[PDB]
Design a protein around this ligand. Structure first.
Ligand SMILES: CCCCCCCCCCCCCCCCCC(=O)OC[C@H](COP(=O)([O-])OCC(O)COP(=O)([O-])OC[C@@H](COC(=O)CCCCCCCCCCCCCCCCC)OC(=O)CCCCCCCCCCCCCCCCC)OC(=O)CCCCCCCCCCCCCCCCC
Ligand SMILES: CCCCCCCCCCCCCCCCCC(=O)OC[C@H](COP(=O)([O-])OCC(O)COP(=O)([O-])OC[C@@H](COC(=O)CCCCCCCCCCCCCCCCC)OC(=O)CCCCCCCCCCCCCCCCC)OC(=O)CCCCCCCCCCCCCCCCC
Ligand SMILES: CCCCCCCCCCCCCCCCCC(=O)OC[C@H](COP(=O)([O-])OCC(O)COP(=O)([O-])OC[C@@H](COC(=O)CCCCCCCCCCCCCCCCC)OC(=O)CCCCCCCCCCCCCCCCC)OC(=O)CCCCCCCCCCCCCCCCC
Ligand SMILES: CCCCC/C=C/C/C=C/C/C=C\C/C=C\CCCC(=O)O[C@H](COC(=O)CCCCCCCCCCCCCCCCC)COP(=O)(O)O[C@@H]1[C@H](O)[C@H](O)[C@@H](O)[C@H](O)[C@H]1O
Ligand SMILES: CCCCCCCCCCCCCCCCCC(=O)OC[C@H](COP(=O)(O)OCCN)OC(=O)CCCCCCCCCCCCCCCCC
Ligand SMILES: CCCCCCCCCCCCCCCCCC(=O)OC[C@H](COP(=O)(O)OCCN)OC(=O)CCCCCCCCCCCCCCCCC
Ligand SMILES: CCCCCCCCCCCCCCCCCC(=O)OC[C@H](COP(=O)(O)OCCN)OC(=O)CCCCCCCCCCCCCCCCC
Ligand SMILES: CCCCCCCCCCCCCCCCCC(=O)OC[C@H](COP(=O)(O)OCCN)OC(=O)CCCCCCCCCCCCCCCCC
Ligand SMILES: CCCCCCCCCCCC(=O)OC[C@H](COP(=O)(O)OCC[N+](C)(C)C)OC(=O)CCCCCCCCCCC
Ligand code: SF4
Lengths: 57, 86, 128, 88, 89, 155, 171, 340, 140, 68, 76
């Protein structure tokens, strides 16, 4: 059975803190920002070339 | 690493705003005759600056600290003649 | 002729100059198929005005009283020290009265668009 | 309503000569000259008839040819009353 | 006071001799109020008196509320008929 | 009387993916009736297959769900194998299972990231298409094509 | 009185004062030196300023023409204090009003120069700067150390002169 | 006159080029967040990209659809751009360093801002499509809804200052930036500014609508340039509102000690250096806010119309009314009503 | 400017569109060259026909092409768009999109790879770079 | 690697004429050893810098301005 | 599942329900009412223990409430 509000482990103030301060949204923004400091994948065609195999048609 | 090509346009924007503001500050000071601008001036300040113009010979914001006014200060008083607000 | 008035005159001039350059330099070849409204590549029939929801009307209408409420506080924030404690009490009373109206709007669900179609929850009963 | 203005030939020829200075095509001084010439059909020349052809009529074609530039009660009110115009 | 007076008179005549649409009536109301406020504000300046400006502020707030209510009335009128006639009232 | 308002959602529309003509009827906000018109990509594939040998018909299956090419091939191959009463050898079966799951990853990358892009989450698309690039290299190395491998065949 | 509106022209009057009216000197300081001297002028000329204002109130409408002799006293007292400042404390007074000219006429931007000016004026003119209306608990702001509000750039000449006075022992 | 002209040309060039390079910065920053490069080819390091887009659009044919009020469709984007740029006349880059030093500068900001909804409102009427009218109606409703939020925060700030002069409001923050006592208002103002510019995740009209690309669907050539320029100009201008209301404008740190070490008297060198420091502080704050606009675009999916109207009228506005109550109460409790 | 601000409207009909998607993906990153895909033909310079064109779709494609403001160019991408491809003998398939619209560049492949499509875009840019505009008017 | 230090190091390794040539053709700054030359005159390079990603370790510098 | 339990049935349970299930309204209301209540209950405490109210600022020229004295000096 789904649990009701009165059987919740977290107090209402902690939940309100998560609600008003957008905790998981901030985690998502941080994950996006981490990518900004990683190496990009781009190659500079036609000066560089993607992989080609002997079977290519 | 820090991607510097992605920072180049931000650097252009930052440099443009910085240089424009510095140039504007220099132009304002030059327009003022070597002092900083007046800001947030009320009616009192406005009248005081008009009186200053009467005392320093029309030299903008130039100040004189001599106790006694010149003779011309007696006769260069201005009233304003305002057109009828129809 | 201070910088304020010159700048305000200058902005529309630049807009008009860009428009004039575009008119002078781009080609202009209207024809019937090009002149059609773009709706995903097809053509739709002309229709009587769509029936709209009341919340669409209500947001725009209720903007005006709330906007006036907010803008009536400008004389207070420009006179707060002069009116200090008496005016503080008065502005509190004014705010509370307007909040009663906000309460009315919230409790009546006045800006909610209700999805007319809802899942059927009736039990299935068989007459044996 | 299409706007027509009549002008003196000298004034209008001067204008068309002036406008020939821009790089895009524009009404010619010689077209103003031709405006005073009415069509003159050679009495002895083959026509559409000799090709077994029958020209269409401008009045019947104009609406089709000009369609993109077209500008655009008592029963309607009574009928309108039965419909819904505002909803939740 | 000329500009306010002319605006008020012409707006009133536009309201009265309106035989075109109902929106013109709404607009003429709004602009008559504007003309009255202009006359009042000029007198307030010439007397150096805050009472005129206070009344003008109140007039602005009341014109806002009157606009809101008038357009609510128009929408309620539209709800039953689906259209506004050039005599729509 | 309720009067529906009718909109052509698509075909030339980002969400309609270029080819769906979704004729919707709205009463204000809500959809009351929906009528998807399709066949803007009807190619007559089923008619064409009847004029082909089974081997010649296999590449048509690549081009049905054209992010899931190898599983399309797999279903046609399994049907023909059942009619032929032959058995795929064990290593072939393992390659088909492995590349079926690679194909499932490719498909789900496309579908989840396209779904997110439609709602407005634009970034998962880029991140997932790099993974798709890596897997398409495996496609190309076994078959010589990035998309239409024609790799899984009856037998 | 309101400022002038849409179109106005300034006009000067070329007449002389009527000869019955005794002539008087006019104050020659501009806004910054006057603001610098204002508290000393208040301290010295309070009785004459009060008498002038009381005359104006009692005249009940004719104040300009009825208080001219009181106004003459007011202006002479102001000229006297500014002359005394120009004779005994000119360097510090100039420090203070030039600082004011750089700081939008805000006294909070010029506390170092003002400290020297106040010490000079008190020692050689026996005038004291004081803010009316405060209780003994309340501290006058110009005497406050470590204020919340500080100038963007402490004035160069004033900083040097203040440090020098602290070495000498005058301040 | 001459100085006035030079100052206006400098300010205008800086603003227009900053707007041009913001589009390049958005493309590059989104790209690197998405593990790609972005424009690096049109000009060195892709630094001429915006100018290529501008010239291309300036040479592109203007189309006037058949059922269209052509005048209204060509003037609506023009007026939105004109109001968007007029907003810059009151932004100061140092004390009194502005084109318009208005004692009613805050009021000017709000009034010109409230002229910002007419583009969306008139663009839909430009044609004769009911898709267009509904989309314009929604976008207008969102715009005025979040206008209320922004105005409320303005008034809450003026409660601390009692002045409509923007320089004065900045000057009072030398004691503390107003984002420190009112940090939730910083969050709310940023959220509302993103909504007011109709940026993601508040981009209903352009990206989930009947028309394929908002109410600019029918625009080509220079009208499209006007709409695009007005949008990015409003991004920077609303960020400047954020900066002077809550971030201390052109204030960074007390450089009195450093200046007294470097210089011994006033000169054009010291004046130029102080101007540079002030302008660089304001510029770096603007850079962080622009980066935040792009970052939020990178991270989130879109709201629906119902979701955002609910967010404004049921969640944000009641909080702002509660703040209307609590701020003057705190000023009263501690006897800290600001003087004029 | 025409080369550097290259804005295509996508007629993303079929599997070819997948390869077009990969041109915008991080490995090739089309927007590094200034390419931005636009929903509206009103804001587009290039039409890329990427997929099988059916008879039911042909008027729709013509309509989208006609609403493009000038100057305008068309790239045919893939065998289906080029000449009908695998479905050339179908009752429901247009045998090449050049029966409906003028075509500036043909990109071969089924599908063309991302690099092949980029090569075709480069060919169109070469054609752009060699266009006479004011020199052509000067010749007149 | 998107770092500025990589670009500065490669430009130093490669020299200013080569820096400007690369900036005017490919737009990045690569430093690697020459492997060989085309019949057409194109030159081919391989780099082993650890800051270069997979599929970027081989590249060509074209002989003519209208490269293809 | 969760539903409004009615304020009048039980005050504290309803307040808990609101804090858990309507945080936006609950904390908007808490913040709104905190102000005036704090004003009434705390300003006298601040006056008694922290610091008294400040002396009023002049608003105009402070006119003496007295008769004009006879005075001397700076005469014509
Ligand atoms: C501030 C942004 C940086 C914050 C995090 C720095 C992370 C890092 O440096 O390591 C990369 C590292 C990648 O590892 P790696 O690539 O294997 O090795 C790094 C390279 O060896 C080394 O790579 P590197 O050479 O890029 O790092 C050294 C770097 C600095 O090294 C430092 O980390 C020093 C400490 C941070 C200060 C940053 C100084 C530079 C700030 C950029 C602005 C330049 C002005 O010095 C520089 O080279 C600066 C770039 C050159 C100038 C850029 C051109 C300026 C154009 C105008 C810009 C003006 C607008 C701004 O990634 C991480 O370690 C995790 C990063 C995740 C960061 C989480 C968020 C941090 C807090 C939020 C920041 C919001 C932005
Ligand atoms: C920069 C200054 C403005 C540049 C305008 C350039 C221009 O006129 O292009 C015309 C050009 C004409 O269009 P069109 O397709 O040829 O239509 C004309 C008919 O098809 C058939 O054409 P039409 O035969 O009826 O001729 C119309 C004629 C107008 O001619 C007349 O109606 C005047 C007739 C009176 C003649 C005699 C006057 C007295 C002369 C004194 C002697 C000298 O316009 C022209 O002839 C060409 C313009 C003249 C330029 C010549 C310059 C030569 C020297 C260099 O406009 C366009 O290309 C359409 C572009 C789309 C415009 C969208 C925005 C329009 C709404 C803007 C509202 C702005 C409100 C702002 C507040
Ligand atoms: C801020 C600044 C402070 C000033 C304003 C103070 C407002 C504070 C109100 C606290 C409300 C907190 C709350 O949770 O309420 C729950 C309530 C929702 O409850 P719910 O159960 O979920 O509603 C759905 C039910 O189905 C609905 O069930 P329902 O239909 O039974 O309605 C429940 C009830 C819920 O409302 C409430 O329970 C809150 C009412 C508290 C205020 C009552 C004041 C009464 C004081 C006089 C004492 C009278 C008895 C004295 C006995 C004699 C003593 C020997 O609704 C009402 O009846 C609204 C009350 C209408 C006014 C009636 C009070 C008469 C005025 C009294 C004047 C006193 C003059 C004193 C003379 C001067 C002396 C110095 O939320 C609200 O009330 C909305 C706010 C509006 C408040 C007004
Ligand atoms: C450095 C450059 C600055 C950088 C960027 C700004 C733009 C630079 C690009 C400059 C020129 C390239 C664009 C020029 C261009 O496409 O018009 C070509 C003609 O071509 C020329 O021969 C007409 C002569 C072209 C005049 C060139 C003027 C250049 C400076 C413009 C200010 C196409 O118009 P078009 O023949 O249909 O002629 C006209 C024209 O489009 C409309 O004004 C007329 O009203 C209409 O009737 C139409 O027929
Ligand atoms: C700042 C730059 C301002 C540049 C504006 C110059 C406008 C010149 C364009 C023009 O000649 O008129 C175009 C206008 C288009 O409207 P129209 O052709 O009548 O209908 C098309 C519907 N598919 O045709 C018109 O109806 C004219 C509307 C405006 C009237 C201006 C007359 C200009 C005459 C040119 C000489
Ligand atoms: C006119 C349209 C509406 C006017 C907008 C009012 C904007 C405003 O607040 O103007 C104030 C400003 C001068 O105000 P202020 O701050 O007191 O200047 C002191 C500077 N030390 O005003 C200015 O600085 C310049 C004047 C701007 C308005 C002039 C417009 C002329 C109106 C006549 C039109 C003729 C027909
Ligand atoms: C999202 C953007 C959030 C960024 C906010 C950064 C805030 C840091 C700067 C705060 C500036 C301020 O208003 O007060 C700063 C002031 C500087 O002191 P000073 O330069 O010596 O001048 C003395 C004259 N008062 O006085 C101070 O130094 C006081 C201490 C700084 C203010 C508190 C900083 C701690 C909390 C920072 C949280 C910021 C939001 C997260
Ligand atoms: C204050 C002014 C600023 C906010 C104004 C907005 C008021 C909105 C309140 C409201 O609308 O009440 C309705 C709501 C009922 O719940 P619901 O089921 O959602 O009703 C929807 C109708 N279909 O009501 C609710 O459920 C939420 C409101 C509960 C109110 C109780 C809050 C009490 C505050 C307690 C903390 C006080 C702080 C410390 C005080 C110390 C001194 C006591
Ligand atoms: C702030 C401005 C900084 C950007 C300027 C450097 C770009 C550049 O000068 O780049 C070189 C440009 C042409 O650029 P390209 O043909 O794309 O070659 C780039 C090589 N690629 C393709 C490998 C990347 O040469 C010029 O004609 C410069 C004249 C432009 C003047 C307009 C400047 C606007 C201000
Ligand atoms: S050419 Fe090949 S890949 Fe492209 S749409 Fe046609 S079948 Fe699919």
């Amino acid at each position: 059975r789904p649990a009701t509000w009165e059987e919740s482990e977290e107090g209402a103030l902690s939940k309100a803190t998560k609600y008003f301060l957008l905790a998981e949204m901030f985690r998502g923004l941080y994950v996006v920002l981490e990518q900004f400091f990683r190496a990009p994948y781009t190659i500079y065609y036609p000066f560089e070339k993607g992989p080609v195999s002997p079977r290519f048609r | 690493a820090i991607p510097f090509e992605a920072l180049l346009p931000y650097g252009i924007i930052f440099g443009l705003l910085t240089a424009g503001g510095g140039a504007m500050q220099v132009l304002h000071v030059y327009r003022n005759g070597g002092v900083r601008d007046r800001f947030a001036i009320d009616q009192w300040d406005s009248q005081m600056m008009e009186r200053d113009l009467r005392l320093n010979g029309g030299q903008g914001r130039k100040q004189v600290d001599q106790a006694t006014a010149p003779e011309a200060f007696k006769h260069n008083h201005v009233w304003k003649s305002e057109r009828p607000l129809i | 002729m201070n910088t304020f008035i010159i700048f305000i005159i200058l902005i529309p001039i630049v807009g008009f100059a860009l428009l004039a350059v575009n008119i002078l330099l781009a080609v202009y070849k209207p024809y019937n198929e090009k002149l059609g409204a773009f709706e995903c590549g097809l053509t739709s029939f002309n229709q009587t005005r769509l029936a709209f929801n009341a919340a669409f009307i209500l947001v725009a209408i209720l903007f005006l009283p709330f906007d006036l409420e907010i803008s009536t506080l400008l004389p207070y924030v420009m006179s707060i020290y002069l009116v200090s404690n008496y005016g503080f009490t008065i502005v509190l009373l004014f705010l509370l009265i307007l909040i009663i109206g906000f309460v009315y709007e919230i409790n009546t669900n006045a800006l909610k668009i209700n999805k007319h179609n809802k899942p059927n929850t009736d039990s299935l009963i068989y007459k044996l | 309503e299409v706007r027509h203005i009549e002008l003196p030939k000298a004034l209008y020829q001067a204008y068309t000569k002036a406008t020939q200075a821009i790089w895009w095509p524009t009404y010619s001084p010689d077209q103003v000259e031709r405006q005073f010439l009415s069509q003159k059909i050679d009495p002895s020349a083959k026509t559409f008839n000799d090709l077994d052809l029958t020209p269409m009529e401008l009045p019947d074609l104009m609406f089709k040819l000009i369609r993109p530039y077209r500008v655009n009660v008592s029963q309607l009110e009574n009928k309108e009353k039965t419909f819904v115009h505002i909803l939740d | 006071m000329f500009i306010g007076t002319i605006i008020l008179v012409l707006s009133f005549l536009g309201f009265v001799f309106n035989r075109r649409n109902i929106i013109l009536a709404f607009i003429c109301l709004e602009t008559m109020l504007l003309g009255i406020n202009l006359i009042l504000l000029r007198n307030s300046v010439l007397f150096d008196d805050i009472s005129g400006s206070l009344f003008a502020i109140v007039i602005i707030i009341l014109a806002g509320v009157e606009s809101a209510i008038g357009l609510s009335l128009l929408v309620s009128y539209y709800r039953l008929r689906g259209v506004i006639n050039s005599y729509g009232i | 009387r309720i009067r529906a308002f009718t909109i052509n959602f698509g075909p030339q529309h980002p969400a309609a993916h270029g080819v769906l003509r979704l004729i919707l009827e709205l009463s204000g906000e809500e959809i009351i009736r929906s009528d998807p018109h399709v066949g803007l990509l009807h190619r007559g594939t089923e008619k064409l297959i009847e004029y082909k040998t089974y081997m010649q018909a296999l590449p048509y299956f690549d081009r049905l769900d054209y992010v899931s090419m190898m599983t399309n091939e797999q279903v046609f191959s399994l049907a023909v194998e059942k009619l032929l009463n032959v058995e795929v050898p064990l290593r072939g079966k393992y390659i088909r299972t492995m590349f079926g799951e690679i194909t499932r990853v490719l498909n789900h990358l496309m579908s989840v990231c396209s779904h997110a892009m439609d709602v407005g989450a634009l970034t998962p698309f880029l991140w997932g298409f790099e993974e798709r690039e890596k897997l398409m290299e495996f496609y190309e190395r076994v078959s010589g094509a990035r998309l239409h491998a024609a790799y899984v065949r009856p037998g | 009185p309101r400022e002038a509106a849409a179109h106005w022209v300034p006009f000067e009057d070329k007449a002389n004062m009527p000869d019955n009216v005794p002539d008087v000197v006019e104050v020659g300081a501009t806004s910054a030196p006057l603001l610098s001297a204002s508290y000393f002028i208040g301290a010295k000329c309070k009785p004459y300023n009060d008498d002038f204002m009381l005359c104006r109130e009692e005249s009940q409408g004719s104040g300009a023409i009825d208080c001219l002799k009181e106004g003459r006293r007011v202006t002479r007292c102001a000229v006297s204090v500014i002359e005394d400042i120009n004779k005994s404390c000119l360097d510090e007074f100039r420090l203070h009003w030039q600082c004011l000219e750089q700081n939008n006429h805000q006294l909070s931007g010029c506390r170092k120069a003002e400290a020297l000016l106040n010490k000079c004026v008190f020692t050689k003119l026996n005038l004291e700067k004081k803010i009316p209306g405060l209780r003994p608990d309340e501290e006058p702001v110009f005497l406050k150390k470590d204020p919340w509000i500080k100038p963007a750039v402490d004035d160069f000449k004033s900083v040097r002169a203040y440090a020098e006075a602290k070495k000498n022992g005058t301040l | 006159m001459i100085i006035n002209i030079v100052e206006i040309l400098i300010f205008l060039v800086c603003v227009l080029f900053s707007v041009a390079y913001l589009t390049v910065a958005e493309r590059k920053t989104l790209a690197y967040m998405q593990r790609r490069l972005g424009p690096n080819f049109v000009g060195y390091y892709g630094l001429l990209q915006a100018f290529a887009d501008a010239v291309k659009l300036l040479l592109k044919e203007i189309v006037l659809p058949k059922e269209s009020n052509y005048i209204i469709l060509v003037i609506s984007p023009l007026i939105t751009l004109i109001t968007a740029l007029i907003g810059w006349v009151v932004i100061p880059l140092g004390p009194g360093i502005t084109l318009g030093e208005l004692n009613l500068g805050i009021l000017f900001s709000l009034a010109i801002g409230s002229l910002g909804v007419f583009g969306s409102l008139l663009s839909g009427w430009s044609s004769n499509s009911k898709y267009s009218l509904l989309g314009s109606i929604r976008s207008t409703a969102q715009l005025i809804s979040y206008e209320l939020i922004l105005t409320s925060i303005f008034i809450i700030i003026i409660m601390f200052v009692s002045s409509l002069n923007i320089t004065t409001i900045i000057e009072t923050q030398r004691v503390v930036w107003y984002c420190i006592p009112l940090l939730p208002l910083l969050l709310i103002f940023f959220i509302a500014s993103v909504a007011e510019t109709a940026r993601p995740p508040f981009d209903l009209t352009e990206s989930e609508s009947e028309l394929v690309a908002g109410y600019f669907t029918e625009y080509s050539g220079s009208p499209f340039v006007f709409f695009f320029l007005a949008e990015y100009s409003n991004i920077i201008l609303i960020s400047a509102f954020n900066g002077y209301l809550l971030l201390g404008g052109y204030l960074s740190f007390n450089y009195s000690y450093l200046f007294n070490i470097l210089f011994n008297d006033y000169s054009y060198v010291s004046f130029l250096f102080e101007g540079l420091i002030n302008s660089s502080a304001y510029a770096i704050k603007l850079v962080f806010l622009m980066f935040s606009f792009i970052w939020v675009r990178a991270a989130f999916p879109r709201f629906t119309y119902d979701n955002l109207i609910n967010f404004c009228w049921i969640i944000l506005l009641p909080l702002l009314f509660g703040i209307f109550l609590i701020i003057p109460s705190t000023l009263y409790i501690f006897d800290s009503f600001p003087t004029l | 400017a025409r080369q550097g601000s290259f804005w295509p409207v996508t007629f993303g009909l079929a599997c070819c569109a997948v390869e077009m998607m990969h041109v915008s993906a991080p490995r090739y990153d089309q927007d590094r060259l200034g390419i931005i895909f636009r929903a509206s033909p009103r804001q587009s310079d290039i039409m890329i026909v990427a997929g099988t064109l059916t008879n039911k779709m042909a008027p729709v494609l013509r309509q989208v092409y006609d609403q493009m403001p000038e100057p305008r160019w068309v790239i045919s991408m893939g065998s289906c768009a080029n000449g009908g491809g695998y479905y050339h003998f179908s009752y429901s398939v247009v045998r090449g999109c050049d029966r409906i619209v003028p075509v500036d560049v043909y990109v071969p492949g089924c599908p063309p790879t991302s690099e092949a499509l980029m090569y075709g875009v480069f060919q169109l840019q070469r054609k752009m770079r060699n266009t006479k505009i004011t020199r052509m008017w000067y010749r007149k | 690697s998107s770092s500025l230090y990589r670009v500065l190091r490669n430009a130093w390794e490669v020299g200013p004429r080569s820096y400007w040539k690369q900036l005017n053709s490919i737009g990045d700054t690569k430093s690697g050893r020459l492997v060989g030359t085309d019949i057409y005159g194109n030159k081919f390079y391989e780099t082993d810098h650890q800051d270069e990603i997979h599929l970027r370790t081989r590249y060509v510098e074209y002989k003519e301005k209208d490269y293809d | 599942i969760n539903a409004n339990p009615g304020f009048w049935n039980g005050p504290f349970r309803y307040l808990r329900w609101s804090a858990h299930n309507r945080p936006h309204l609950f904390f908007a209301f808490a913040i709104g009412i905190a102000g005036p209540v704090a004003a009434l209950t705390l300003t006298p405490l601040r006056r008694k223990y922290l610091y008294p109210d400040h002396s009023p600022l002049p608003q105009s020229y402070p006119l003496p409430q007295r008769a004009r004295e006879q005075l001397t000096g700076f005469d014509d």
